[PDB]
Design a protein around this nucleic acid. Structure first.
Ligand code: K
Ligand code: K
Ligand code: K
Ligand code: MG
Ligand code: MG
Length: 136
RNA sequence: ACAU
DNA sequence: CGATGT
């Protein structure tokens, strides 16, 4: 199994979990940063990994790109497949923003179509995903 | 266990 | 060491 280098790699970064969440997408081949989300003051790792995939899908669809997306998140890959983000994060005023974005990502999934393959980045074999934040 |  | 998830 080899890396499909013609792909978009996404990843979350956090300060705390739950904590400040951000995410970015990069060209798997070159590392060029293609998008970066403004930090969200409270979310979970898995909410951010989910938002990152969905943003990638929208980014690639807007550009008429058939590239696959790599994610290292088993959880978020499944949530996108299911079109349902099964987060445990409490809903209150401080988590309102992340839940709004998660709700809206689900809604996008339920109103749009895509053929984009969503692939597991095999960290054990390949090292850190190219979108990783270098914080671990 | 596995993946973050 | 702790947290998020299947
Ligand atoms: K990191
Ligand atoms: K990882
Ligand atoms: K666990
Ligand atoms: Mg990740
Ligand atoms: Mg990472």
């Amino acid at each position: 199994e080899e890396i499909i280098w013609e792909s978009l790699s996404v990843d979350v970064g956090s300060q705390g979990n739950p904590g400040i969440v951000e995410y970015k997408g990069v060209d798997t081949k070159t590392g060029e940063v293609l998008f970066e989300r403004e930090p969200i003051p409270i979310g979970t790792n898995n909410m951010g990994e989910f938002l990152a995939i969905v943003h990638g899908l929208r980014y690639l669809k807007e550009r008429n790109s058939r590239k696959p997306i790599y994610s290292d998140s088993q959880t978020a890959i499944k949530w996108v497949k299911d079109k349902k983000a099964k987060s445990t994060l409490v809903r209150n005023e401080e988590t309102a923003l992340i839940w709004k974005l998660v709700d809206e990502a689900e809604e996008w999934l339920n109103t749009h179509t895509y053929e984009t393959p969503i692939l597991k980045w095999q960290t054990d074999k390949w090292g850190e995903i190219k979108a990783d934040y270098g914080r671990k």
